[PDB]
């Protein structure tokens, strides 16, 4: 356990915070506590929609929950039917002005946490450990990314001896700040236990 999280490095250097407000000492404590309910319910449900990055910008007791997600019509339903069910179930938890939008994950391979998920799924899915990770990466320099890398990391394939694996390609340079890379932590669950997964993608130097 030697290295550092890539996102938490470029905190306003080549990335950005999800929750982007202000707050006082009185408010920040409670105000944030809220976001971690907003992002606990929102997640727990939206899973099989492929949810990515969850913005929560804030004005005077106006919450502004944007949502990037693989599949905008499993957030929606038919017509506008199921998005409403939630848009209030949040104002049910806040007690205020939930503006819960939707924004499609255009290219899905070119956004890490998704990439992480489908793999962690594929491991839950009892697939070919290696090939999962190979094709994982495969598609990433197939959609057109600068760099790719996936790190399967459990008791792998059902083995009693805990190991780890991976592969990659292209530029992976996390010591260049000015290189934008997205981290994806997933976390499969299989009969033998729990097998966290990682995925890093380079898009470009700026």
């Amino acid at each position: 356990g030697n290295k550092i999280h890539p996102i938490g490095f470029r905190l306003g250097i080549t990335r950005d915070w999800e929750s982007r407000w202000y707050a006082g000492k009185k408010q920040y404590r409670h105000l944030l506590l809220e976001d971690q309910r907003i992002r606990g319910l929102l997640e727990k449900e939206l899973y099989s929609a492929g949810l990515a990055r969850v913005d929560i910008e804030r004005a005077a007791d106006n919450v502004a929950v944007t949502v990037h997600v693989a599949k905008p019509g499993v957030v929606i339903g038919r017509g506008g039917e199921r998005i409403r069910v939630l848009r209030e179930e949040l104002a049910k938890l806040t007690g205020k002005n939930v503006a819960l939008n939707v924004q499609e994950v255009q290219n899905p391979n070119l956004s890490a946490p998704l990439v992480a998920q489908r793999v962690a799924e594929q491991i839950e899915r009892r697939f070919a450990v290696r090939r999962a990770i190979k094709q994982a990466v495969q598609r990433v320099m197939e959609s057109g990314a600068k760099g790719a890398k996936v790190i399967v990391s459990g008791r792998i394939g059902g083995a009693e001896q805990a190991r780890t694996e991976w592969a990659a390609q292209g530029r992976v340079p996390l010591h260049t700040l000015r290189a934008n890379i997205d981290y994806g932590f997933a976390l499969a669950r299989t009969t033998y236990g729990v097998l966290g997964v990682k995925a890093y993608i380079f898009l470009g130097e700026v």
Binding site: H5, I7, G8, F9, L11, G12, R15, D16, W17, E18, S19, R20, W21, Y22, A23, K25, Y28, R29, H30, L32, L33, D35, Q36, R39
Partner: protein, 60 residues
């Protein structure tokens, strides 16, 4: 976090002295910042996702 022991600190107590905080996110009251309602493990873990606004990574 013994589940019921988040609750012995949630509700208000017999006398006001017993008012010890805890983590909303995990229920370890051992090292908690009454500004995040969070501990040190959490605060990083989260800050490392940029999920706490304005929380930068420091250097001088």
């Amino acid at each position: 976090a013994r589940k019921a022991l988040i609750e012995k600190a949630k509700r208000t107590p017999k006398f006001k002295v017993r008012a010890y905080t805890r983590c909303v996110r995990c229920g370890r009251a051992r090292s908690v910042y009454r500004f995040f309602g969070l501990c040190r493990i959490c605060l990083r873990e989260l800050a490392h996702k940029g999920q706490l606004p304005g929380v930068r990574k420091a250097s001088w």
